[PDB]
Amino acid sequence: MNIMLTLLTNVTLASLLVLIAFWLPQLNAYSEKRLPFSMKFFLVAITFLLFDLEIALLLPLPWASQTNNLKTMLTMALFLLILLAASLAYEWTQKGLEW
Amino acid sequence: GYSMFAVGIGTLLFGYWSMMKWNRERRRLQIEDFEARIALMPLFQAEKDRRVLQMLRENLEEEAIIMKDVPDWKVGESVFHTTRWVTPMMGELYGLRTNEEILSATYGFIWYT
């Protein structure tokens, strides 16, 4: 409930400050007078998504190091990182990282 | 060229050695803390069993009082075919208590920061 109150306070202050900023200068009287779709940017976004999935796989490593099966855990972590490096190498070699 | 790499490797090795010593000491300290917890555990288990049994008995007395006029009710009937002891759920111990302590026992650890 403390985090809920903290988020509520942050959002409330942000909303209040932005609203007063947007409404204070609106009381005075004044004059009051495409296609391209680059493939490269989509490829960058997709590469980010896949690498982020592999990061999601690698995340539990700080806890994985207390198992008594240290050899198996080390082998599997190195396997995950090696396949991540292989994905990067495949994207590099097939001209997937050019501009 | 060579000297810069030598300095970098040297500071890396010094840091590795210092962290190795400190982490081994931290492992020993954690073992000591876990041993203290292990020594304290049996008293906590006895107190927990006594508290759970007291709550169950109080709920049983209140159920006997409330469900007196219900025709087909049986006071303190089990929902299981087996006679083995079953660990009670949260709603069984705090079902008839006030909302503040219900919410405590449910969300106190999760909401504590």
Partner: protein
């Protein structure tokens, strides 16, 4: 089906140990060293019977043993213990490593008064053995009788009588 048996509220009356977590943590090592036997009897009973209602007497015994231990500490080593657990109570993690000095004093005092030796590293986590007169429960799971297995036919294989016997096939 059936009625859940619960002990009366009188069965759950015992002189409670009314000290906080810092006091317990300060004396945890000596408490584990001195009060090992009732605690291990109670824990063996708890893990064997799998029923809280079958372990009440051992719980009262462990409470009594803790009370005796704390009375000895009070009668002998009051002030160093007070300083030690005030130390421990200050910290938000209740760490042992901040004021070892006070700990030393407490240790020294008990070694002069009760001849108590603090257990070393790796000693309170040992798996020990308990000599108890409580009979070993035979069906702690309250299991029913297992259904009998299938007959498990066995014998010598002979060729199928007149073959496959599928429509007009003679083999």
């Amino acid at each position: 089906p059936g009625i859940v048996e619960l002990p009366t509220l009188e069965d759950l009356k015992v002189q409670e140990v009314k000290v906080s977590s810092s006091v317990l943590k300060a004396a945890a090592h000596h408490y584990g060293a001195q009060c090992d036997k009732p605690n291990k009897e109670f824990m063996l009973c708890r893990w064997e019977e799998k029923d809280p209602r079958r372990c009440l007497e051992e719980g009262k015994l462990v409470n009594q043993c803790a009370l005796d231990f704390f009375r000895q500490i009070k009668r002998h080593c009051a002030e160093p213990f007070t300083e030690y657990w005030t130390c421990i109570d200050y910290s938000g993690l209740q760490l042992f490593r901040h004021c070892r000095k006070q700990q030393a004093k407490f240790d020294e005092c008990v070694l002069d008064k009760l001849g108590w030796v603090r257990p070393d590293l790796g000693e309170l986590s040992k798996v020990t053995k308990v000599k108890t007169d409580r009979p070993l429960p035979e069906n702690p799971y309250h299991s029913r009788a297992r259904p009998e297995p299938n007959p498990e036919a066995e014998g010598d294989l002979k060729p199928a009588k007149h073959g496959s016997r599928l429509f007009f096939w003679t083999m």
